[model samples]
Target: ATFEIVNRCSYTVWAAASKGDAALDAGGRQLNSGESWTINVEPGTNGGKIWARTDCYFDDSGSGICKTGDCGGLLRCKRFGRPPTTLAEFSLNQYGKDYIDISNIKGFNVPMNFSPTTRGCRGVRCAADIVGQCPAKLKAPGGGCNDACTVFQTSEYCCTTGKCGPTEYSRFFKRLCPDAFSYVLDKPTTVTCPGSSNYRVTFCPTA
Candidate 1:
């Protein structure tokens, strides 16, 4: 598969990374002034890092080429990990008129893995299909959603049939597996080759 990147400058620059598994790998190609190029690179392993680079642009321009400090910020640095789509209940910070406050709520990142369900939080039997993926929703337990619903959003498997269409996505999740986590499951965190890491990249907004 291929990924996209945006180069702010037209000049050529080197890509860099600090602890990335593929620190030596660079993305993008040289282009004319004010030009854009899409560089091709092999797929990034799970939990690997992807960063951009340049030689004479760091700490006053006297740094060595391919130096350690140049890669992470030379261009752009993106860690390879799963993004969070589930919402963490513990992160709720209630906003009042003048004071900002937070409250501790139940639920962990994901007490349990993903699986389909019929009788979920809302009592909607067959409310959602637990076959391939989970449903979409507001929060995990509340708002009538479930685990299958939450996991599906950030995973490879989700809504294949569009049965739980966009509108009812939330309801389907809430109905089947309540008590879902509060983080998206985008990029994998750890690296086991193709295995997914626990690194969270995205999460749903909660109030």
Candidate 2:
């Protein structure tokens, strides 16, 4: 399967992926507005993730700091960046199928869209003004947001008890992007499609 990472935001951002194999650009790169990168995914690839970083400054060595989505101050992220980084997650060729999801469980930065280019499959997105209208308590230092778990970390928000339901914060995220994974238990938002379906992930996608 193939994945295209596109930037529609009006500003530059550093894109990162948790699965940093060469097929994914060694896991990170700068994407100026209107830029895009393509990725090839072999069958059975698992636990793939993509997200954007904001307000970053990197030297020639690809070392830098970011206001949001920084992974140990490195341009190449070895794992999912910090909280508030909206996620486009993937599992390819699982049980002869592919799965995708947009998650705000960590939080939200730029609006995002995740969809297949084929198979007539459904698309999903989280394209709300989450940062601009973020609740103060759930706001992050940069242009991103933290879900209740990031701020509260309690069983009520974290679901550490293994059984919990939506709260005020979860509802807020759900309202903003009903198709996104608002919390750990938000399985209804996940989508499964035919294997080999090419995918597209756009940052700051038009609403």
Candidate 3:
């Protein structure tokens, strides 16, 4: 499987991608607007994810900070990035198929889309003005909306205790980005595709 990461944000975006326990991983790189990178996924790789980091400056030592999606402050991320990030997630070759989704459960930083480049399949996109429309209580320090779990850290949004349901905060994101996962355990978050399909993750997509 392959993933094409594209930047259309009219600014520089650092792309980060990785899969658990893979010998080869996507070392982070700066992607100027209109630039793209394609990566080959190890067969049967699960827990694969791709995201973008904005407003970053790395030193000669390859250490820096990003306004959002900073992972270990390393040019190449080795773990999951920080929250308030848009995510394109997938699990490949599971039971002879692939499962993919755009998850906003952590939050939103940029407009994005996850689509198939192979066999015909529905694409998922989130381009709403989530940051501008974010409620004051759910707003993060930077220019991204925060998930309820990150803001309140309660049972309802965190799902740490008892049966949890979507809060007004979760619904706020859901109403804006219906195609993306808005909260924990959200249904319809999985988009199944046939085996060996190529996919794309485009940032600041028009559609």
Candidate 4:
């Protein structure tokens, strides 16, 4: 599969991906406004994730931090980013289909759109301006909205007990991006497509 990563944001965005997976520039690099790059993923690659980092500063040694979506301060992120980062998650050949979703369960930083390039497949996205309109209680110190779990850290918010459901906080996210995973138990976010489908992930899609 291939991912045509696009940056539609006005400012520069630093893109990151999981280990051994394809990223636009080697492992990571700057993506200026209106630029795009394609990264090819090998077959049977499962549990891969991609996201964008905003407001970053890295020295020649590649040591620095991103205000949002910093993956342990590494330009090449081998793992998931920190909270308040929007996520594009995928699992290829899962149950005979490609499972994909845009999750804000950890919170939303940048708006994202995940769409299939090939025919006969569906698209899913979360392009809401979550940060600009984030509720006061769910707002993060640096930037982006904080998830219920991040804000309250209770069973009712984290759903650790597996008995929790949506709250006003979760509904806030759902109302903006109904196709996204708004909370721990949000089931409407997932989209299953043919395993052979190619995808495109756009950052700040509406920008």
Q: If the candidates were sorted by their TM-score against the true structure, best first, what order would they fall in?
A: 3, 2, 4, 1
Per-residue lDDT of candidate 4, residues 1-207 (tens digit): 889899999989988877433443355667999989678766666867788888898988777899888877878666667788788888887667888888888888888999998886788878877888899998888888989898788999898988889999989999989998888787766888997688999998876
> Which residue runs does candidate 2 get wrong by more than 4 Å?
20-23
TM-scores for all candidates: the values are 0.23, 0.94, 0.94, 0.92
* Candidate 3: residue 106 Cα off by (Å): 0.5
Candidate 1 structure quality by residue, lDDT tens digits, 38-136? 333333332232222322243443333332113333333332212221211111111311110110111112111211111121210121222124333
Better of 2 and 4 by TM-score: 2
Give stretches of model 3 more than 4 Å off: 20-24
List per-prediction Cα lDDT, in the order shown: 0.26, 0.84, 0.83, 0.82
Q: Which stretches of candidate 4 lie over 4 Å from their true place?
A: 19-25
lDDT of 1: 0.26
Q: Compare the candidates by lDDT and give the number of the best one.
A: 2
* Clashing pairs in model 2, backbone N/Cα/C closer than 3 A: none
Worst 10 residues of 2 by lDDT: 18-27
